[PDB]
Amino acid sequence: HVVVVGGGVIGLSVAWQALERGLRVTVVDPEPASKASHVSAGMLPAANEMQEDLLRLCLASRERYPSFVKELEAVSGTSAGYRRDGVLDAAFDDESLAALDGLRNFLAPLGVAVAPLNARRCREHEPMLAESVRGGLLGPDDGAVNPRELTAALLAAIDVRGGTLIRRRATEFLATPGVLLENGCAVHGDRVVLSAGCWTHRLAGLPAGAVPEIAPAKGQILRLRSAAPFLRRATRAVTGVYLVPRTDGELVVGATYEERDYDTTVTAGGVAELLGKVLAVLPGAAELELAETAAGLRPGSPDGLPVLGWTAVPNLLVATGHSRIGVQLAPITADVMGEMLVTGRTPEVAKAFAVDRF
Amino acid sequence: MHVVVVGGGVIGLSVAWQALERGLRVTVVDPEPASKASHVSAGMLPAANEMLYSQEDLLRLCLASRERYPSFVKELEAVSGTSAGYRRDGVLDAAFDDESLAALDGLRNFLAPLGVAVAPLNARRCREHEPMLAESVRGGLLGPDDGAVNPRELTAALLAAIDVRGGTLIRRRATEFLADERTPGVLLENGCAVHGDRVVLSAGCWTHRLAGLPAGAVPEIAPAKGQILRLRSAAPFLRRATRAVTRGSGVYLVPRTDGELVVGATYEERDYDTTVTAGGVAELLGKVLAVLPGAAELELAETAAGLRPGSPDGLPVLGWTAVPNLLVATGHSRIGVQLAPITADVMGEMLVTGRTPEVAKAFAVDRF
Ligand SMILES: Cc1cc2nc3c(=O)[nH]c(=O)nc-3n(C[C@H](O)[C@H](O)[C@H](O)COP(=O)(O)OP(=O)(O)OC[C@H]3O[C@@H](n4cnc5c(N)ncnc54)[C@H](O)[C@@H]3O)c2cc1C
Ligand SMILES: Cc1cc2nc3c(=O)[nH]c(=O)nc-3n(C[C@H](O)[C@H](O)[C@H](O)COP(=O)(O)OP(=O)(O)OC[C@H]3O[C@@H](n4cnc5c(N)ncnc54)[C@H](O)[C@@H]3O)c2cc1C
Ligand SMILES: CCCCCC[C@H](CC(=O)O)SCC(=O)O
Ligand SMILES: CCCCCC[C@H](CC(=O)O)SCC(=O)O
Domain range for residue B122? Predict the structure, then answer.
């Protein structure tokens, strides 16, 4: 029996896979998949700026995505919203075209399908790009997922396998381990896993130093809409901004990266920045409906790398600090914590993210 | 006597109220009163704007409405016991380059003849009146007797007042005009009918569209779309209604007492569409951030989009139609909130006396 605290994409995912491996699971979260995971664009390109250990974690998660989704859609009988029709990286000036050559050279060694495109061919793949486009890479095996549909499926699956969901705040950690809930009741389990995003470290009762600081990094994000999709595929455009089309006309446009503590106010400043970026690279998007503006807090860590594994406190694990890439990493995270729970050992691929490194 | 008012936006609630004030019996027909252009409107009340340099008739209409605003609000707040949201702490015009500073000298010269309080301000003094302006500000005029109203609060009061005086509100669409009987009337979506001794049409850009209207009776009141946004802070960010012009176009910025900050507006040709667009919102945000750099931090609380009621020559349409006992009051485009009160008087008088006040003659329907 494992108690998972926080039920965003990371903790739902851990909970599901733990169930898949015969364990008994309880998820504690007053509003599951309501925070960063609700707001997230869920883009899944092969890589990004953010280093070699983390790369190996990502590529593995990438390897696993298709099988993870399929296993899930089967259990839940729900769609998860994973699309694999490719990610397009587009560059708009010398400096960003330079970075793309660097990127190609980074990706080929690792058997990631990449296809360089000249300006002409960038425009043929996406007619809606601005003529100022200079070059681009297509990564046809990459794509995007809708985290809203993914977290819904995870819930359905967790339920189907008979995991419990307690929609209450965990107010305190208890020494077997357990948590106290806002309504006075307690939940203990043979293992506790903390996966509460930027609130993880804040839970009262945690022994000093047990969990590192998971600092919020605010991100505003918007969603445009049209009757039929406007953009052909997940598209990332740099001088940057990313643009994730959904099957139903939704078009996600992210993202600001800001340091504002726990604030999730949508600001004239934020929205203008995003709108400027997207209109710059997709001039026809002017008439697209502005359907939603929103703002989430990315879970950070002191060195900006994920925090997975055992704490100094016995039977108390964590799975958090995924910052900009939790949707991408969710599946590997769920395996690695699975194994950890069952075997008690730490898979090689996760060793670099132990908590004890601080 | 009994007048049926069709449409209950600011113009028609206003007409209905004043008509009641003058002893008449009134029925307002509107499925969603004050939900359209009047719901979205910023409600700015500066002394003038661009449409008035050339139209001396419309200027006179506006100035009269201006004269009347304070008395109209007071009479209303009394009857309704509600606040209407009228603030008179001034409108500030600010210029940000040569070309817009030139226009302001022109504006000063336009306004003095007409006994409108204006006070020119150098860059220094612009920044003292509004600390939040960008350093690039060049010059500005203050019009301390001007200001703004919150149309949402105004239209609520009008409703309360209309009720208090016992006017009827029928929350249904008028589907058809009923013509050629001893008295005029409208048919409603639910099959029922309402006749009255007079019908007044005041349905914005829908006015002309009502079925059963004799051809040519009402001119085309073409929709002119406008997107508009509202930012917010706990305490007001801007001291007063502010209109800022730079690099050829402008933006207006209307603070409310409670932190709301209205930012308008796009002028677009999209028929009846009221979609909020990346394009629209970006335009507005750009303009405001340019002239109020600190507004970056402000919450974006609302984005919205209304349809201004136009007319073939862009002037209001008030008075009798060729159809007997059928009047109109519409076509106020960008300035209906400002004109609402004079509109209400002029239509009042018209209803009671049967004659057309001089100030309104230039806006007769028959001019087409
Ligand atoms: C704008 C934006 C765009 C993004 N785009 C992408 C992208 O394109 N691709 C990608 O891979 N990643 C993206 N991410 C990252 C991804 O969403 C995060 O890494 C992800 O949320 C991590 O999941 P989480 O469950 O740790 O955090 P969350 O989703 O924040 O979940 C934390 C959960 O903990 C719960 N909680 C808090 N306190 C308590 C308590 N006391 N008791 C119980 N529960 C509690 C909350 O209710 C919440 O549901 C993006 C993030 C943002 C903000
Ligand atoms: C973005 C924006 C900003 C503005 N800013 C300002 C400003 O600063 N100052 C200013 O003076 N003005 C401003 N205006 C202008 C002012 O809003 C309009 O001129 C005014 O709202 C017009 O009033 P109306 O009552 O004629 O229009 P509306 O309020 O649109 O009247 C139409 C009404 O008729 C009703 N209706 C429609 N069909 C029927 C039917 N068949 N039967 C019954 N009822 C019906 C509708 O339900 C609606 O309530 C602005 C307008 C916009 C769009
Ligand atoms: C390993 C790929 C994970 C993709 C997330 C990429 C996104 C775009 C980028 O950094 O290029 S960051 C999403 C965000 O947190 O705004
Ligand atoms: C004297 C009429 C004042 C109302 C209109 C003022 C606003 C600013 C301007 O035109 O300069 S226009 C409101 C609109 O966007 O329709």
Answer: 88-145+221-311
